[PDB]
């Protein structure tokens, strides 16, 4: 048969985070596309990030780096939060070298051709008097999240997904004759690589292809709609 | 096991470990006798 | 009441009632039992009018 008026609207919280509402859905389909959209947003969007880092002078003792107050653990934590977009499929190495007492920022890194650092004002470490920091970075594209995978180089947890946090909920908004229809609320928070709008659009395209895989099976009758 | 005192009754296999020396009397006898 | 005065019999009744209620592990704040006891002592009898 036919069911119509499934509109989609967006409430903008921040530039990197938004809520979307898909309403109204039949008593099905509230939870069918609920978890699938979230898992797609999380695992299916391509994005580039760090894989491994190597810092000199810290090789055998990973506990502390002289000249800086932060430990190596805090350095890796700060470094995993860096947002980067790379066009090269093969891995690309960057370098960050800064001397003298002060504060290192993401802008102090020199991006090789094709890669872009989206948050220059991010904090990495602070250099003590007569301090110097030299660190190699490995950046490559991927999807989702993967744990730690030349001696002196350590792997990190790679956060490839351009989206950070996605949560969903379902609520009833139907007609008085029904009062049971589902409605989907999606809270999505993404990195500076893309807006939540583009993340949702890419997830929709990928899932359209996924399901489309099935449609090609018979290309036959199914529930029609009015507005897309 | 069989409970074959009643004809045509469905076969309900019984876990019973003890024999029944006496059968349930007429459940309405309290009324009909009176 | 007659020996130790009205100010003491209120304490006696409150603690006895609250003790019975505490024997069963019941949390009743004392102010309620005090509100009830206060009503018990509001009149005086008359010996010689």
């Amino acid at each position: 048969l036919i069911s119509q008026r499934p509109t989609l609207s967006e409430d903008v919280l921040t530039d990197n985070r938004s809520q979307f509402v898909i309403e109204p859905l039949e008593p099905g389909f509230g939870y069918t596309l609920g978890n699938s959209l979230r898992r797609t947003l999380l695992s299916s969007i391509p994005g580039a990030a760090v894989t491994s880092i190597r810092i000199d002078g810290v090789l055998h003792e990973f506990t502390t780096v002289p000249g800086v107050k932060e430990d190596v653990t805090e350095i890796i934590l700060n470094l995993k939060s860096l947002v980067v977009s790379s066009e090269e499929d093969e891995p690309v190495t960057m370098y960050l070298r800064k001397q003298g007492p002060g504060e290192v920022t993401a802008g102090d890194i020199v991006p090789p051709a094709g890669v872009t650092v989206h948050n220059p004002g991010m904090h990495i470490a602070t250099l003590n008097d007569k301090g110097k920091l030299e660190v190699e970075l490995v950046v490559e594209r991927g999807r989702g999240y993967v744990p730690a995978v030349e001696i002196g180089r350590i792997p990190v947890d790679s956060i490839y997904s351009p989206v950070l946090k996605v949560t969903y909920k379902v609520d009833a908004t139907r007609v008085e004759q029904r009062t049971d229809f589902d409605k989907l609320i999606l809270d999505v928070e993404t990195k500076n690589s893309i807006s939540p709008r583009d993340a949702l659009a890419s997830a929709g395209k990928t899932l359209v292809e996924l399901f489309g895989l099935a449609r090609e099976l018979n290309v036959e009758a199914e529930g029609i709609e009015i507005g897309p | 096991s069989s409970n074959n005192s009643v004809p045509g009754a469905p076969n309900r296999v019984s876990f019973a470990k003890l024999r029944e020396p006496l059968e349930v009397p007429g459940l309405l006898d309290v009324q009909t006798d009176s | 009441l007659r020996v130790q005065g009205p100010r003491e019999v209120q304490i006696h009744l409150v603690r006895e009632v609250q003790e019975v209620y505490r024997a069963q592990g019941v949390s009743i704040h004392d102010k309620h039992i005090e509100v009830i006891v206060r009503q018990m002592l509001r009149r005086v009898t008359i010996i010689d009018s």
Partner: protein, 570 residues
């Protein structure tokens, strides 16, 4: 603040309202055709109904009405079906379950009645028991089980932080809780695994805050490291923004204390929304908790046969001793009762010793969600001794647990006590009800009249070899009072001044300074001619602040005394 209201009930209850609004719109020409339209149930009414109901509260009541919280106001939401949908947190107030209970709905009409419903009787406005001040409307049992499972710590779980060994890094730290969520989506990070996370949006404990920051300030986005579980992180997310991080396994006692502090300091609406979020998360993680019953999860004590053999050897010694006429008959029965009491306790101890701490039965009991261990002892361990119809103990106990199944004799013996109690409760509730009625009658004339008696009279409460020994009655007697004479000690300072709320911080600071006794105002010594004064009565339990003037505390006191009446046994 919501209740599920069937469509038919709402249409019949609001019938004149929907008729008026249905004449406003041109669905009906006159009011008689409007009545006929609401009686025929033509569809046009329903869209109108949803309008007339909006922001119009109703009153839900469950009999018997033991305290004022037995009637509560709700905002009605139209619901498909013919059943009333009740919020799960307001059960404890109503003593309402869903084993076949029914409730009644009353529609206020006048503006003043609707205002009293929205302000005085609103569900989310009364979160505290007016009797004890404790908070009802706290996660009840299922909800807790979920929280208990969500915040508990599992040594050796998946994703557990491990220190760096050789060339192997730590791999137990996460930059943000979102990264921990992503790691939990994969099979890498368990929710109950101990890890390290950088928390930007949560306030640390007082210790970590005072060390890493100043006492005066912490701000959103200020990062700090914590060794917790992701579950405890998500739990602390439910709590409001300013509350410090807890990092504890959430027993019902602990979350009870949390809600106590939230009600003592934070406003009411925040507490209501907080317990709502706790409800949601508790139900989700209760579904995910994996608590189930099976004949395998019920573990029989392994040495029970030997224990029973030994204690019945003792009892056989006692009976052989009685056969020579040495022991008295009543003394014989007393001795047997003692022997089998000890045997019951020993079997229960063995049972608890054999039960792993992750078993669903032990998890249910010890999390404080529901049950007590004596039910676990009767279920798996042993029934024990059973009551006589006269009330005495029978010298032979029931050695069979309900897992093994009782014999014919043990079942027949158990029936005695079972029915004895079933009958006793029917008279006990009547006694409690009559006493409550008499209390209501004698006390209903007691209401607050003026603000302050101004009298310096009061009463002395303890609160306490040269060490502090706390008084068990502080909550029932000392707490919630008003200080008539400000606290003074040796080398004294201003610690608690006359007329203070005497809450938890005041009590703690009083006890720390070396205070061992206090003299506080009370209703007993109040000097008002008719009624009582607010300052002498103290804070209102349900509100937490000073009692208002219009309050009729005699009825609140009568209900508070008579409500747990059916619990008093011999």
């Amino acid at each position: 603040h919501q209740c599920g209201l069937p469509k038919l009930m709402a249409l019949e209850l609001f019938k004149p309202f929907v008729m008026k609004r249905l004449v406003d719109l041109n669905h009906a020409q006159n009011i008689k055709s409007a009545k006929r339209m609401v009686e025929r149930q033509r569809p046009q009414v329903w869209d109108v109904l949803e309008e007339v109901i909006a922001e119009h509260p109703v009153l839900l009541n469950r009999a018997p009405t033991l305290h004022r919280l037995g009637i509560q106001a709700f905002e009605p939401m139209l619901v498909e079906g013919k059943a009333i949908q009740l919020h799960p947190l307001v059960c404890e107030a109503f003593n309402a379950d869903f084993d076949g209970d029914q409730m009644a709905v009353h529609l206020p009409l006048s503006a003043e009645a609707q205002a009293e419903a929205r302000i005085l009787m609103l569900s989310s406005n009364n979160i505290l028991s007016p009797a004890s001040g404790r908070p009802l409307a706290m996660p009840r049992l299922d909800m807790v089980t979920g929280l208990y499972y969500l915040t508990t710590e599992v040594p050796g779980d998946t994703g557990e932080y491990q220190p760096a060994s050789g060339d192997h890094p730590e791999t137990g730290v996460y930059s943000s809780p979102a990264e921990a969520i992503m790691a939990a989506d994969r099979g890498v990070l368990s929710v109950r695994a101990k890890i390290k996370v950088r928390l930007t949006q949560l306030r640390p404990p007082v210790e970590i805050e005072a060390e890493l920051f100043g006492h005066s300030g912490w701000q959103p986005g200020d990062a700090w490291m914590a060794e917790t579980t992701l579950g405890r992180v998500m739990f602390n997310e439910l709590l409001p923004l300013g509350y410090p991080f807890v990092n504890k396994q959430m027993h019902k006692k602990v979350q009870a204390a949390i809600i106590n502090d939230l009600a003592e300091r934070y406003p009411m609406i925040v507490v209501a929304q907080t317990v709502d979020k706790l409800k949601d998360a508790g139900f989700y993680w209760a579904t995910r908790s994996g608590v189930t019953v099976s004949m395998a999860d019920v573990l029989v004590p392994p040495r029970k046969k030997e224990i029973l053999d030994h204690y019945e050897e003792r009892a056989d010694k006692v009976e052989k001793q009685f056969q020579r006429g040495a022991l008295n008959h009543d003394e014989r029965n007393e001795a047997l009762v003692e022997i089998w009491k000890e045997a019951t306790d020993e079997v229960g101890q063995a049972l608890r010793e054999h039960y792993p701490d992750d078993n669903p039965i032990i998890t249910i009991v010890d999390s404080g969600a529901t049950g007590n261990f004596t039910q676990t002892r009767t279920l798996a361990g042993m029934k024990g001794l059973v009551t006589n119809p006269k009330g005495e103990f029978i010298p032979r106990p029931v050695k069979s647990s309900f897992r093994e199944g009782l014999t014919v004799l043990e079942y027949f013996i158990n029936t005695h006590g079972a029915r004895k109690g079933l009958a006793d409760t029917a008279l006990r509730t009547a006694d409690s009800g009559y006493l409550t009625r008499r209390l209501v009658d004698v006390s209903q004339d007691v209401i607050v009249r003026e603000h302050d008696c101004q009298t310096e009279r009061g009463i002395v409460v303890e609160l306490a070899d040269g060490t502090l020994i706390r008084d068990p009655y502080i909550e029932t007697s000392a707490y919630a009072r008003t200080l008539g004479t400000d606290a003074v000690d040796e080398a004294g300072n201003v610690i608690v001044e006359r007329g203070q709320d005497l809450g938890d911080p005041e009590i703690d600071a009083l006890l720390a300074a070396g205070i061992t006794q206090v003299k506080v105002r009370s209703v007993l010594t109040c000097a008002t001619s008719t009624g009582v004064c607010a300052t002498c009565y103290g804070r209102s339990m349900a509100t937490g602040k000073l009692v208002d003037i219009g309050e009729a505390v005699g009825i609140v006191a009568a209900q508070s005394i008579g409500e747990p009446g059916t619990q008093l046994t011999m």
